[PDB]
Write an enzyme that holds these catalytic residues in place. Structure first.
Site, PDB file in Angstrom:
ATOM      1  CE1 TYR B 505      -2.506   3.511   0.887  1.00 59.43           C
ATOM      2  CE2 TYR B 505      -3.259   2.522   2.941  1.00 59.43           C
ATOM      3  CZ  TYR B 505      -3.258   3.578   2.056  1.00 59.43           C
ATOM      4  OH  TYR B 505      -4.009   4.711   2.347  1.00 59.43           O
ATOM      5  CB  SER B 588      -5.393   2.482  -4.399  1.00 61.97           C
ATOM      6  OG  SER B 588      -6.722   2.025  -4.484  1.00 61.97           O
ATOM      7  CE1 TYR B 589       0.549   7.911  -2.608  1.00 62.26           C
ATOM      8  CE2 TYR B 589       2.073   6.046  -2.410  1.00 62.26           C
ATOM      9  CZ  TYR B 589       1.838   7.424  -2.447  1.00 62.26           C
ATOM     10  OH  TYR B 589       2.888   8.308  -2.325  1.00 62.26           O
ATOM     11  CG  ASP B 666     -11.586   3.360 -10.591  1.00 61.92           C
ATOM     12  OD1 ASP B 666     -10.501   2.806 -10.328  1.00 61.92           O
ATOM     13  OD2 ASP B 666     -12.111   4.152  -9.786  1.00 61.92           O
ATOM     14  CG  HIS B 698     -10.635   2.425  -6.746  1.00 63.77           C
ATOM     15  ND1 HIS B 698      -9.644   2.570  -7.692  1.00 63.77           N
ATOM     16  CD2 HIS B 698     -10.013   2.409  -5.549  1.00 63.77           C
ATOM     17  CE1 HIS B 698      -8.470   2.636  -7.091  1.00 63.77           C
ATOM     18  NE2 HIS B 698      -8.666   2.545  -5.791  1.00 63.77           N
TER      19      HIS B 698
HETATM   20  N1  RUM Z   1      -8.868   4.839  -2.606  1.00 64.72           N
HETATM   21  C1  RUM Z   1      -7.857   5.311  -2.935  1.00 64.72           C
HETATM   22  C2  RUM Z   1      -6.749   5.846  -3.327  1.00 64.72           C
HETATM   23  C3  RUM Z   1      -6.548   6.056  -4.697  1.00 64.72           C
HETATM   24  C4  RUM Z   1      -5.365   6.655  -5.159  1.00 64.72           C
HETATM   25  C5  RUM Z   1      -4.354   7.032  -4.274  1.00 64.72           C
HETATM   26  C6  RUM Z   1      -4.502   6.824  -2.899  1.00 64.72           C
HETATM   27  C7  RUM Z   1      -5.661   6.244  -2.374  1.00 64.72           C
HETATM   28  C8  RUM Z   1      -5.764   6.078  -0.873  1.00 64.72           C
HETATM   29  N2  RUM Z   1      -6.156   4.721  -0.458  1.00 64.72           N
HETATM   30  C9  RUM Z   1      -7.307   4.462   0.368  1.00 64.72           C
HETATM   31  N3  RUM Z   1      -8.121   5.476   0.914  1.00 64.72           N
HETATM   32  C10 RUM Z   1      -7.361   6.441   1.730  1.00 64.72           C
HETATM   33  C11 RUM Z   1      -8.074   7.773   1.940  1.00 64.72           C
HETATM   34  C12 RUM Z   1      -9.558   7.573   2.208  1.00 64.72           C
HETATM   35  C13 RUM Z   1     -10.157   6.895   0.977  1.00 64.72           C
HETATM   36  N4  RUM Z   1      -9.870   7.710  -0.182  1.00 64.72           N
HETATM   37  C14 RUM Z   1      -9.587   5.479   0.771  1.00 64.72           C
HETATM   38  N5  RUM Z   1      -7.605   3.189   0.735  1.00 64.72           N
HETATM   39  C15 RUM Z   1      -6.890   2.113   0.352  1.00 64.72           C
HETATM   40  C16 RUM Z   1      -5.769   2.265  -0.464  1.00 64.72           C
HETATM   41 BR1  RUM Z   1      -4.681   0.819  -1.040  1.00 64.72          BR
HETATM   42  C17 RUM Z   1      -5.374   3.621  -0.890  1.00 64.72           C
HETATM   43  O1  RUM Z   1      -4.358   3.724  -1.613  1.00 64.72           O
END
Ligand code: RUM
Ligand SMILES: *[C@@H]1O[C@H](CO)[C@@H](O[C@@H]2O[C@H](CO)[C@@H](O)[C@H](O)[C@H]2NC(C)=O)[C@H](O)[C@H]1NC(C)=O
Ligand SMILES: *[C@@H]1O[C@H](CO)[C@@H](O[C@@H]2O[C@H](CO)[C@@H](O)[C@H](O)[C@H]2NC(C)=O)[C@H](O)[C@H]1NC(C)=O
Ligand SMILES: *[C@@H]1O[C@H](CO)[C@@H](O[C@@H]2O[C@H](CO)[C@@H](O)[C@H](O)[C@H]2NC(C)=O)[C@H](O)[C@H]1NC(C)=O
Ligand SMILES: *[C@@H]1O[C@H](CO)[C@@H](O[C@@H]2O[C@H](CO)[C@@H](O)[C@H](O)[C@H]2NC(C)=O)[C@H](O)[C@H]1NC(C)=O
Ligand code: RUM
Ligand code: NAG
Ligand code: NAG
Ligand code: NAG
Ligand code: NAG
Ligand code: NAG
Ligand code: NAG
Ligand code: NAG
Ligand code: NAG
EC number: 3.4.14.5
Lengths: 730, 724
Positions: B505, B588-589, B666, B698
């Site tokens: 992550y 995601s990230y 998404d 997503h």
């Molecule tokens: N969702 C999403 C997201 C998309 C792009 C970049 C960063 C994020 C942040 N994120 C979140 N969130 C973190 C902030 C609160 C919500 N946006 C969910 N949850 C799980 C993962 Br893996 C992740 O990378």
């Protein structure tokens, strides 16, 4: 090594164009002269002598990169085209300047606007017609203000002198909907109305620096949707004035067309004052040719009912893809055109302007491909008669006064290296260039038609012949098989040093659409060449039911039933190839693009057990998704009272469960305006819903061609990996 | 036998929970049938039968009982929108009369519904407007008239506030006794729209174009207004008057966010606001005025939380927990040394005194009573991945008792809590490292009442399976502890070499190394495929102080990427890892970092998977992105936006095998982001694999899609690792 051939035709050779085919592309200007590029030379067809027409260094002093050029019929002006931006298959936008040859300098006054959609000279002199913002403009002189012909042009709604998406791709194979009369007095045009035509929307991502994707919107009628409407006009360009608006005389369609939805499918000028129109019903089994004369005293056009000609079919649609075009005699009281005879073969029928019954001037169990030239004494045409090989093409000369007097002009010129010909005639057919594609290296030659004798070899591809000498190339085997006592033709790209006692892996390369022909004598340097030369894969192709150039019995068999016989015929072909003893039937694959991809999928989804894997590239998945003109031609309408049942039964989706037995690769360009991405997005979703694993690849911003330099190389590489894997090739 | 992919996909081994909703201070409801339970005796009488609504005709999605216990709200026709938002149809059942209300019903396609905290008042949102029902059978009063689809949102959040500010759809806040309704209004008039295709059912001939107002980094943001209405004086003759509470002067100077809303008393409300440059926030305390009917927020009652090394809050400034008189509150803030601890505040005083200290962090304030404050933290054993419940004596801050540490120290190291209405009882939930454990406790003497769910069912089944094990530990980099965890194949042999997959992550304030017990994809890879799955919390990770968390401030795509590579390097030197077979994958990230790593050209990884990855920071939303990156303008941080793209590293992908996957519908990480990755690989001629998921968002969360993606990835990994 003892000088044996040890190198092969690699994928790098294919993708990097190591072995290039030379072409001899010319463009006639008089009856005895033509232009060719190296520089631009005027060549004398009589002697061979050439003088430099335009030095390559003349437009160095310009400022922009020049995409193309067009000299005026009278050779006094040259139109230079730059800032080319592609649109669809034929359409584009470009800036234009005009260079005066006699003054030797660029016209700086009254310039053709940026973002011009189409430009054209008159057939004689130097009149100019162009379309800008969907409106038609005419310049009588290159340096004078242009008269505006239409005022109704509107983006995505009204098209004056240019075609809408569907007419461009499916009807005219052109963006242009302008037609000059033989001497440039009249300028005929079509106007398209897309008001209620639904829009296809899709994302275009563009350069990385575009923050928010673009949504592209295109009026695109899917099977059954509201079609665009068409109107036709003629304007006299000699009676234009810079004080009154130009008056465009409307020629209306015959009454039998206005009864429902119809298309304009052909425009042809017969004489200076006579024009021929062909119209088609939306149910494309009925067409009407109108012949219209300019009336002197009123200044309008009349198509007498007694000169109408009906062409129709009881077994299918009319024409191979549309009704054939008429070729008129000088007086314009007669014409020749290809139509299918009683035994369902397409032949040249001789019509009189105002009589219903035409007489057939050619007969046989073969077809005329096209009428290429007509003079006072002879008619020149291309057909596949020679040795009864549908996959061949030769030039023929028929005596107008004696139909028994047929001479083949190309059959015996070079029997072994040349069995696929096309021709280019001089302005009065005094000379012609012959273009041979295969089975050997392409060959270009020039001829005098008075005595039919070669003047000289234009291009013999000997520089390529040199390079191939050391290369282990594949061979082609063009032959046939009997099925329901009908002959069906196939071609096989066979690997070097082919052993009939060995078992090879086999790739079935398919198109198989209505009037297709994947079995011919053409010489190709393509993906299949590599697979054979390098990987020792046999690449086969088969022309089953629905394929063209061998009569309507074969071609129309699929009428109203796409996704049936042609699909099964491909499957049957593979069973047959296996029964020839040299095919490893645990390693048999299939691929195709467009209609080919659809058939591939229907085959892989059929649970036949024959195929191990396949690749579909930009395939149709369900016919309600594809355009009306093409789809309805073969399928009728997707309504309960017409053909909804077969539309519903011929999709790829409903066969998703079956893909559990095969390895499936599915490829599609996101900005495909032809066969929409949608279509693959529905296949992928169906395969997910039944839990089938597959491989996939999208091409960001690629269209139906996936034709950009980098995208082309990447897909072919990607496909080659998949195929080598499925066949266990290291 | 091993834990298989089918096992994970079809949930053969089920983790049982014990979900409860406290109804009073000694009673709670529990689904089965719905029973009421006494916290004291554990006896239960049925509240409503399994099929009382047998003749209802609709499929009941969720029930919601009013606080006075007199009415039950029923939810059906549930249509998911984004992460938290949805549409639904409703019916109110009179518990006394035993029949549904049929006059003045709640409309179809309602966006949000909520009971007031006491009694049976009920406010809802429909077509972006707020309605209030005093009585379930009576007509509703329309509060707002300005609601307009995609443009004005009354009582509900727009895309960016739903996802990145409130983690909820509702922007409604009742006062503690229901007299007042506080709400936010969002204006999306000039927020640009993300457009994408929706293909839908096979029978849809022309694809749908979905359009959502969605501010990408540096774009125009929605604007916000705050209102308060008095529900006790609502005329069905005159229009309801809403009192606006304007943000403080220090916020109105530029772009800003309303980031928190908290009622203090029956007449006092606190609001937190945040500058678009999210390193400065202000909390207002607003008091109701009687002989004027307005709300006043004195400039002397404002509190400023700021940061010089980064942004403020973990993801947003922390929420305050007020004393009963509301003249004092507690909230988590980072201290002088950078650790997050509880500060005690006086409504009137600029200063606050810290009541907790140390090199660990308070995760959250859970309950505040007259004599104790309860909180969760990761102090036990100096483990940032542990979670325990702590009691702090308010009269003396040195008297701290760990309420969960010793209960079952072997199997339980991760706890969350649920106190009853007045904190008389609490339910502890333990999530690992052993099977989850649910227990009921009496807060007057901390004594345990009973075990609610011990998961002995699952435990039986798991006895028959060769399960993997987990190692949680740390390594030292530049004299600092960085934590990692590892899912180890059963019968793990130190002297054997294993393929390793790095699960990533690694976003700001992430924590992938912890004591939680999880049955997931990694479980199958360790059980059946014999793959170590490791995770690693390097720089920018959370719950370990600002120094580590703020390290990547303004520099996303750097230290967190470098650290995942080093972790893999450290894992190599551990002896049991085959360094010819190391992979990385991330969502995601997680996908962004995975792609950055694979494009780094370190030579460490053979292959990787990036699922729905961010590819460049201008494609992503403003709230989240600018929190860490600032604005993508030449005077701010444009250069680093341009340096931190996946596209710019496309050349290095020639060294690796890459699988790149994205859902087309998404709304969060737009398919755009992956479309540009692939274009770039294409432009430099890198062969890679791809997979799109038609109409998936997503989450790629639909039954079949979910089974598809995990199956596809298993194949890719097994192939990368030469596994049959
Ligand atoms: N969702 C999403 C997201 C998309 C792009 C970049 C960063 C994020 C942040 N994120 C979140 N969130 C973190 C902030 C609160 C919500 N946006 C969910 N949850 C799980 C993962 Br893996 C992740 O990378
Ligand atoms: C193009 O066709 C459209 C309809 O196909 C025309 O719009 C119609 O105009 C008529 C006559 O004025 C009106 O009855 C309606 O308002 C329109 N029809 C409908 C139902 O849309 C339009 O006029 C045509 N455009 C041109 C310039 O030819
Ligand atoms: C030629 O036709 C055009 C288009 O109809 C005329 O321009 C319009 O004239 C009408 C009324 O005659 C006006 O209402 C519009 O304002 C004009 N629109 C424009 C500027 O395109 C044009 O005047 C005609 N030319 C002449 C003089 O015959
Ligand atoms: C939402 O914000 C928009 C955008 O600022 C406001 O629209 C402006 O309103 C004023 C006064 O009505 C006009 O003079 C401007 O032209 C508008 N700007 C634009 C570009 O629309 C609007 O006031 C706000 N709406 C609500 C309900 O708060
Ligand atoms: C409450 O206020 C709303 C909005 O201000 C009123 O609705 C509008 O009323 C005005 C006249 O006062 C009309 O011109 C608008 O067309 C109305 N909008 C619509 C269609 O809702 C509403 O009338 C007020 N109601 C009460 C109880 O006074
Ligand atoms: N193009 C195309 C296309 C797309 C989907 C289905 C069928 C077609 C027809 N077609 C054509 N055309 C045939 C009709 C004229 C143009 N539309 C091009 N050329 C090559 C292949 Br392969 C093919 O399948
Ligand atoms: C070819 O040669 C002739 C010789 O009479 C010459 O006059 C002519 O210009 C040449 N033809 C062309 C078109 O260059
Ligand atoms: C076309 O565009 C160019 C550059 O934008 C401009 O300089 C030129 O004058 C234009 N041509 C005209 C006059 O239509
Ligand atoms: C072209 O044909 C028209 C119509 O027959 C005629 O009037 C005109 O004079 C011709 N053009 C020339 C210059 O011969
Ligand atoms: C044209 O097609 C329709 C539907 O296939 C058919 O009913 C009709 O007979 C055909 N018309 C002609 C002239 O053959
Ligand atoms: C539990 O039992 C007690 C008496 O033993 C009773 O007073 C109470 O109402 C019961 N509660 C429930 C909800 O079952
Ligand atoms: C919700 O919609 C359905 C069908 O469209 C309708 O029959 C029903 O009465 C609606 N419910 C309410 C409360 O409006
Ligand atoms: C809630 O608080 C308000 C405002 O102080 C007060 O007037 C009222 O008595 C309370 N409501 C009830 C019914 O307890
Ligand atoms: C907050 O914003 C930026 C962070 O890059 C910085 O220039 C500014 O000084 C910060 N403000 C304070 C006082 O922390």
């Amino acid at each position: 090594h003892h000088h044996h051939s040890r190198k092969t035709y690699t994928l790098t050779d294919y993708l990097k164009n190591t072995y290039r085919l030379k072409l001899y592309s010319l463009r006639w200007i008089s009856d005895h002269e033509y232009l060719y590029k190296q520089n631009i030379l005027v060549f004398n067809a009589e002697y061979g002598n050439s003088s430099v027409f335009l030095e390559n260094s003349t437009f160095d002093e310009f400022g922009h990169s020049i995409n193309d050029y067009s000299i005026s019929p009278d050779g006094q002006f040259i139109l230079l085209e730059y800032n080319y931006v592609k649109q669809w298959r034929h359409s584009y936008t470009a800036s234009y300047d005009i260079y005066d040859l006699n003054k030797r300098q660029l016209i700086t006054e009254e310039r053709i606007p940026n973002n011009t959609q189409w430009v054209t000279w008159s057939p004689v002199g130097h009149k100019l017609a162009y379309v800008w913002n969907n409106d038609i403009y005419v310049k009588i002189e290159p340096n004078l203000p242009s008269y505006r012909i239409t005022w109704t042009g509107k983006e995505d709604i009204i098209y004056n002198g240019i075609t809408d998406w569907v007419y461009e791709e499916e009807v005219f194979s052109a963006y242009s909907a302008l037609w000059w009369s033989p001497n440039g007095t009249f300028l005929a045009y079509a106007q398209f109305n897309d008001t209620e035509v639904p829009l296809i929307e899709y994302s275009f991502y563009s350069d990385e620096s575009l923050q928010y994707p673009k949504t592209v919107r295109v009026p695109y009628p899917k099977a059954g949707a509201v079609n665009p409407t068409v109107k036709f006009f003629v304007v006299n360009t000699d009676s234009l004035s810079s004080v009154t608006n130009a008056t465009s005389i409307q020629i209306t369609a015959p009454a039998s067309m206005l009864i429902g939805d119809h298309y304009l499918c052909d425009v042809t000028w017969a004489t200076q004052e006579r024009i021929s129109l062909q119209w088609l019903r939306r149910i494309q089994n009925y067409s009407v040719m109108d012949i219209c004369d300019y009336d002197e005293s009123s200044g309008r056009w009349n198509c007498l009912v007694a000169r109408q000609h009906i062409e129709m079919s009881t077994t299918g649609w009319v024409g191979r893809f549309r009704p054939s075009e008429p070729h008129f005699t000088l007086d314009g009281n007669s014409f020749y055109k290809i139509i299918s005879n009683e035994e369902g073969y397409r032949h040249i029928c001789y019509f009189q302007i105002d009589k219903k019954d035409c007489t057939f001037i050619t007969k046989g169990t073969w077809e005329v491909i096209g009428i290429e030239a007509l003079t006072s004494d002879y008619l020149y045409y291309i057909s596949n008669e020679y040795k009864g090989m549908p996959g061949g093409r030769n030039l023929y000369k028929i005596q107008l006064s004696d139909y028994t007097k047929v001479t083949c002009l190309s059959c015996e010129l070079n029997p072994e290296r040349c069995q696929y010909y096309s021709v280019s005639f001089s302005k009065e057919a005094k000379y012609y260039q012959l273009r041979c594609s295969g089975p050997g290296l392409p060959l270009y030659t020039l001829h005098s038609s008075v005595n039919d004798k070669g003047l000289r070899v234009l291009e013999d591809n000997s520089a390529l012949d040199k390079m191939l000498q050391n290369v282990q190339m594949p061979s082609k085997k063009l032959d046939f098989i009997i099925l329901n006592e009908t002959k069906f033709w196939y071609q096989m790209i066979l690997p070097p040093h082919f052993d009939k006692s060995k078992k090879y892996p086999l790739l079935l390369d398919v198109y198989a659409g209505p009037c297709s022909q994947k079995a011919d004598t053409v010489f190709r340097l393509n993906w299949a060449t590599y697979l054979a030369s390098t990987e020792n894969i046999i690449v086969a192709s088969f022309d089953g039911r629905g394929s063209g150039y061998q009569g309507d019995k074969i071609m129309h068999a699929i009428n109203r039933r796409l996704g049936t016989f042609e699909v099964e015929d491909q499957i049957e072909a593979a069973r047959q190839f296996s029964k020839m003893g040299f095919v490893d039937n645990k390693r048999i694959a299939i691929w195709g693009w467009s209609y080919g991809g659809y058939v591939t999928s229907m085959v892989l989804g059929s649970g036949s057990g024959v195929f191990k894997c396949g690749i579909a590239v930009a395939p149709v998945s369900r016919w309600e998704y594809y355009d009306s003109v093409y789809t309805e031609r073969y399928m009728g309408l997707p309504t309960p009272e017409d053909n909804l049942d077969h539309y519903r039964n011929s999709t790829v989706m409903s066969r998703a469960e079956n893909f559990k037995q095969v390895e499936y690769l599915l490829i599609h360009g996101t900005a495909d305006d032809n066969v929409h991405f949608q279509q693959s997005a529905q296949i992928s979703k169906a395969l997910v819903d039944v839990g089938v694993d597959f491989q996939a690849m999208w091409y960001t911003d690629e269209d139906h061609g996936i034709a950009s330099s980098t995208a082309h190389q990447h897909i072919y590489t990607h496909m080659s990996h998949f195929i080598k894997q499925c066949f266990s090739l290291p």
